[PDB]
């Protein structure tokens, strides 16, 4: 059966208003051996990212003459979901890795390090929708932690349409039953979209509304990212946009 996505009072299945972010928790430099690391948590989506700083390439001809080669990997641990996800990478996992890589390529100043590869490894520890965004942000921060210079930090939310209501930051449930799921990532200071996807259905209007809301969310997240950079540790109890 279908669960009701916006309850009689105007709150969602987890009791959030249409414009409220899930609880965010960020910490940097958590892994000894990585050059940069970060754990990111939005609600129940938990990702860890490790970065291996600019180094030359083992296969010589595969390097780039003026650029760093970004090597990115989005992967879901078998116990991140309600039923054991298979470790061997899925088509979904492959697409996401590319979408994320490209996202990062627009932020990282890859020209600074020719002939070098920068490894970005990402693991989802619990999936609860928007796993790809938690992953990307974890990466962005892990890169920053690694001291690798980028244009800006990357911040992102999944925005969507529930019971005809446009909602911010989706549930596992909301991803599953809602009309639309639209991940958006930004370099907020530059007002630059880095990742943008929609699956589902929207009128051009709804599209533009959800879009406006996604920004407001992203900005709040971006501030916590700045904070995580300074103090190495950030917690945020859920709040309205």
Ligand X SMILES: Nc1ncnc2c1ncn2[C@@H]1O[C@H](COP(=O)(O)O[C@H]2[C@@H](O)[C@H](n3cnc4c(N)ncnc43)O[C@@H]2COP(=O)(O)O[C@H]2[C@@H](O)[C@H](n3cnc4c(N)ncnc43)O[C@@H]2COP(=O)(O)O[C@H]2[C@@H](O)[C@H](n3cnc4c(N)ncnc43)O[C@@H]2COP(=O)(O)O)[C@@H](O)[C@H]1O
Round to whole Å and give the CA distance between 159 and 169. 5
Round to whole Å and give the CA distance between 102 and 105. 5
Binding letters toward ligand X, positions 76-115, x by CB under 6 A: -----x---x----xxx-----------------------
The residues, any chain, with a CB within 8 Å of residue 102's CB and separated by 6 or more, are 195
Binding segment (CB under 6 A) for ligand X, from list 101-109, 124-132, 135-143, 229-237? 124-132
Question: DSSP strand E in 45-144: where?
Answer: 45-56, 69-76, 116-126
Round to whole Å and give the CA distance between 223 and 212. 18
Binding segment (CB under 6 A) for ligand X, from list 30-38, 67-75, 99-107, 169-177? 169-177
**Does 131 help bind Cl ion (rule: CB under 5 A)?**
yes
Contact residue for a second copy among 58, 91, 230, 237 (CB under 8 A): 58
Q: Residue 191 in contact with residue 206, Cβ under 8 Å?
A: no
Contact residue for ligand X among 145, 172, 174, 225 (CB under 6 A): 172
Q: Minimum distance between the CB of residue 112 and Cl ion, rounded to whole angstroms?
A: 31
Burial code (b: 16+ CB inside 10 Å, e: under 16) for 57-81 equals eeeeeebbeebbbbebbbbbbeebe
**Does 175 help bind ligand X (rule: CB under 6 A)?**
yes
Q: Minimum distance between the CB of residue 62 and a second copy, rounded to whole angstroms?
A: 9
Q: Footprint of ligand X on this chain (CB under 6 A)? A: 81, 85, 90-92, 127-129, 131, 172, 175-176, 181, 199
């Amino acid at each position: 059966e279908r669960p009701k996505l916006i309850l009689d009072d105007g709150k969602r299945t987890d009791g959030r208003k249409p414009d409220e972010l899930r609880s965010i928790k960020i910490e940097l430099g958590v892994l000894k051996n990585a050059d940069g690391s970060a754990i990111f948590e939005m609600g129940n989506t938990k990702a860890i990212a490790a970065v291996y700083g600019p180094k030359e390439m083992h296969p010589r001809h595969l390097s780039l003459p003026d650029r760093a080669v970004l090597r990115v990997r989005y992967h879901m641990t078998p116990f991140s979901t309600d039923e054991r996800k298979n470790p061997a990478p899925s088509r979904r996992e492959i697409e996401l890795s590319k979408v994320i890589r490209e996202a990062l390529e627009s932020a990282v100043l890859v020209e600074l390090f020719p002939r070098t590869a920068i490894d970005v490894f990402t693991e989802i520890l619990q999936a609860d929708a928007g796993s790809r965004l938690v992953s990307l942000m974890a990466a962005s921060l892990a890169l920053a932690d690694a001291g690798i210079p980028m244009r800006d930090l990357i911040a992102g939310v999944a925005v969507g349409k529930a019971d005809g209501v446009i909602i911010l930051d989706l549930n596992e449930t909301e991803d599953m039953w809602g009309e639309a799921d639209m991940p958006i990532a930004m370099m907020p200071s530059l007002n630059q979209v880095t990742l943008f996807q929609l699956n589902g259905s929207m009128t051009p209007d709804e599209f533009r509304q959800a879009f406006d809301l996604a920004v407001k969310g992203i900005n709040i997240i971006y501030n916590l990212e700045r904070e995580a950079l300074k103090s190495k540790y950030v917690e945020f109890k859920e709040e309205g946009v």
